[PDB]
Amino acid sequence: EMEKEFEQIDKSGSWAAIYQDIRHEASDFPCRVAKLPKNKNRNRYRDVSPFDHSRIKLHQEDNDYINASLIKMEEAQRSYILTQGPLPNTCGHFWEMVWEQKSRGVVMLNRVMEKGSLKCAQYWPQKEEKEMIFEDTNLKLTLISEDIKSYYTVRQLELENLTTQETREILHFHYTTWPDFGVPESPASFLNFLFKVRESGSLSPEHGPVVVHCSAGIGRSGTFCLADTCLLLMDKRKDPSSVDIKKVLLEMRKFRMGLIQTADQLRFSYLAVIEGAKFIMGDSSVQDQWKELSHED
Numbered sequence: 001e002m003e004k005e006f007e008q009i010d011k012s013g014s015w016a017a018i019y020q021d022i023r024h025e026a027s028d029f030p031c032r033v034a035k036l037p038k039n040k041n042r043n044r045y046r047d048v049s050p051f052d053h054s055r056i057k058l059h060q061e062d063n064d065y066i067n068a069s070l071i072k073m074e075e076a077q078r079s080y081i082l083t084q085g086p087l088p089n090t091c092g093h094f095w096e097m098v099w100e101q102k103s104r105g106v107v108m109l110n111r112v113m114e115k116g117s118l119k120c121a122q123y124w125p126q127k128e129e130k131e132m133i134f135e136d137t138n139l140k141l142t143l144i145s146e147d148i149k150s151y152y153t154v155r156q157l158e159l160e161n162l163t164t165q166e167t168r169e170i171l172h173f174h175y176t177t178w179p180d181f182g183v184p185e186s187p188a189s190f191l192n193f194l195f196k197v198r199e200s201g202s203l204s205p206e207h208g209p210v211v212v213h214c215s216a217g218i219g220r221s222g223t224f225c226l227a228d229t230c231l232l233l234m235d236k237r238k239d240p241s242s243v244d245i246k247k248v249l250l251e252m253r254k255f256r257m258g259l260i261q262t263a264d265q266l267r268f269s270y271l272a273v274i275e276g277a278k279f280i281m282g283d284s285s286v287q288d289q290w291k292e293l294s295h296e297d
């Protein structure tokens with residue numbers, strides 16, 4: 001069973017060794033476009049770039065580049081777009097991507113300001129009477145409402161293509177207490193949040209891929225997507241213990257570099273998937289238990 005393996009690794013203190021094996025076996029593909037001198041100011045970090053083969057292209061004749069990758073999980077039957085936290089000059093690009101890809105939801109796992117340094121730009125309106133307009137991409141964003149919780153906030157936003165005047169409702173899921181290179185507080189808090197995104201219907205195949213991002217778009221976002229995909233797999237092959245988390249992660253890194261940034265986030269991923277498995281195979285009360293333990297109120 002999954003628990004026995006998790007316990008064996010914990011006992012021998014091998015999480016750092018497993019994580020290191022992952023970095024060494026991980027795919028390596030070119031990122032030429034990301035490295036073009038003209039795209040230098042479109043990347044938040046120097047050594048974090050989307051692979052050329054899976055990068056998301058903007059539908060604009062000028063510069064189609066944005067630091068975002070399309071993670072397509074064939075067997076699990078789900079796609080996610082992982083991107084960095086928008087910079088002061090790429091907020092228009094960010095929303096242009098949401099529109100063109102037809103995304104229904106956006107998942108933010110970092111904070112605009114963490115420990116002083118600006119870890120991300122304020123790309124969505126904080127007050128309803130203050131809509132935002134992105135002149136470069138000709139888009140309008142309005143805060144329709146928001147439900148604030150102890151560790152996460154869900155916002156309803158209206159995105160409008162000012163060119164065609166078409167309107168779309170975007171759901172914003174902001175996890176506010178997940179530190180850089182850190183982990184969520186308990187599997188219950190994480191899963192409670194993950195299931196909030198699921199039930200909203202934002203991850204449905206009827207919509208474009210959900211856009212997920214943290215600061216660099218690989219650590220926290222990698223953890224969120226790995227857990228979701230694994231819970232998806234062990235509900236599909238109805239033989240959960242066959243799902244090899246390490247292999248799933250390596251499959252994901254084929255689409256974007258450095259997913260999961262610490263040995264501890266890897267361990268958490270196992271903890272979250274194991275705890276989440278309870279639901280996937282029977283228990284229809286553990287969800288309330290998670291909401292209970294999460295202390296979202």
Ligand SMILES: O=P(O)(O)C(F)(F)c1ccc(CCCCc2ccc(C(F)(F)P(=O)(O)O)cc2)cc1
Nearest residue numbers: 045046047180181214215216217218219220221261
């Ligand atoms: O000479 P200097 O020291 O100034 C420097 F240039 F070498 C220099 C270059 C690059 C970096 C930052 C590298 C990316 C960090 C990053 C990765 C992951 C996460 C996250 F894991 F946290 P995530 O959850 O947002 O993905 C956040 C940030 C630092 C310093």
